[PDB]
């Protein structure tokens, strides 16, 4: 399945929100998972949704007030421990220059570049609320002294330097590249006239999302 591709897992392996927000509330997007029993408060974060609850009935809470992640108190959390960052970057390099995995999209139909840009925008919005470790009973509380993740920016910079990845991004929705979550992907069972009409056009919704998030949402950096 596309969501199990090693590049996607590498790029979506960020640490938990609770690891840097501590026990205090914060403004962030809130995911609820029906399988793990996370409803009516007791809600997880985006990283937990992508990693801890991959395959569960995890959705986004539209009416989201300020909240923290408590995935630890209800299920086994794989996002509380962060691996070696240098090894992560090295593996990203090797997977970019060794396999054409970057061309394949994920289960949501978004190419790796779009996912990385959206992650960078969301992280820039959220991490500004990170209170540093100010100096001034719960023994099972997870460790909460680690910095917020900073891998998304490096991954975006390095993937943008790759020609194949950028070409697959920009030519996404064209004749060759077609996302599974698009009505024009499977049209081989239609009448030839409808096939011609659908085949004439090319897709630019994903490219428009990528450009909009790169230009108007990623306000933090010009790099």
């Amino acid at each position: 399945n596309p969501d199990d591709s090693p590049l996607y897992v590498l790029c979506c392996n960020d640490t938990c929100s609770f690891t840097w927000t501590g026990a205090e509330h914060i403004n962030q997007d809130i995911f609820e998972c029906r399988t793990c029993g996370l409803l009516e408060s007791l809600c997880c974060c985006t990283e937990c949704a992508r990693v801890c609850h991959k395959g569960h009935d995890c959705k986004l809470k539209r009416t989201s007030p300020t909240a923290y992640c408590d995935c630890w108190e209800k299920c086994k959390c794989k996002t509380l421990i962060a691996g070696q960052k240098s090894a992560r970057l090295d593996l990203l390099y090797r997977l970019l220059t060794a396999t054409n995995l970057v061309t394949l999209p994920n289960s949501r139909g978004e190419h790796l570049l779009l996912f990385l840009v959206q992650t960078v925008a969301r992280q820039t919005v959220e991490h500004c609320q990170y209170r540093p470790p100010r100096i001034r009973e719960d023994s099972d509380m997870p460790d909460h002294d680690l910095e917020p993740p900073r891998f998304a920016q490096l991954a975006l910079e390095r993937v943008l330097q790759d020609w194949n990845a950028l070409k697959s991004m920009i030519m996404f929705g064209s004749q060759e590249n077609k996302d599974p979550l698009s009505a024009s992907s499977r049209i081989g069972h239609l009448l030839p006239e409808e096939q011609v009409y659908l085949n004439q056009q090319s897709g630019t919704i994903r490219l428009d999302c990528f450009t909009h998030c790169l230009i108007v949402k990623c306000t933090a950096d010009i790099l």
Partner: protein, 247 residues
Amino acid sequence: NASSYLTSASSLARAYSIVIRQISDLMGLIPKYNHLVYSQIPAAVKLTYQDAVNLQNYVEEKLIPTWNWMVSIMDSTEAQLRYGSALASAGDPGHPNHPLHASQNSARRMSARGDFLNYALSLMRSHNDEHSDVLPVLDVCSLKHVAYVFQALIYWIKAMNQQTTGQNHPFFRRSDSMTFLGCIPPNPFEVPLAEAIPLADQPHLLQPNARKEDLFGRPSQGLYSSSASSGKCLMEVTVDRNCLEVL
């Protein structure tokens, strides 16, 4: 009480239609000028064959610009409608963006800024041939003048054209009641019942507002292929309004 541009455009198009109808009637009277016009009317002008040919050339040269205008607009809107139908056939009815959804009922139920932004994005994507999985943003109810002009020109063309004018048994060919004017009929032996004549399989599809397509199958056009680039041997597939003016 309203002071709308569309009303003025429609009224001017109506006047143009009246004038074009009169022109077509006059030119159709040319072949029988002597029997109908010359003898009965005391004061008539002698007409010669070369005069009639020059007259026809003059009329065609004068009507060319409006003809190009209507052809461009109509090819554009037909391409938009055909793409919408194809996407509806290839789309998910549950999504709010599907053509065949209640949200698109246009009577049961965004901001003005959002509407204009949608229109602008649709125009740009259509021009660059990039309108995929997004419904074209168009208002056919605002094309009344184009309708009048097209009606007038088709009237002129039809009137003057009528002025000019066991296998394969007449029993085996589709009749007027089912055939589509200008489209070849589905081959009676290749296609099954469920897709040739859907009404026979499902006789409850008969409704007062029921399309002929879903009652007697989807016809096809013999265009695009078979070479030639006359501009009408190639089907209208491009969705902008410039390329169908270039064509």
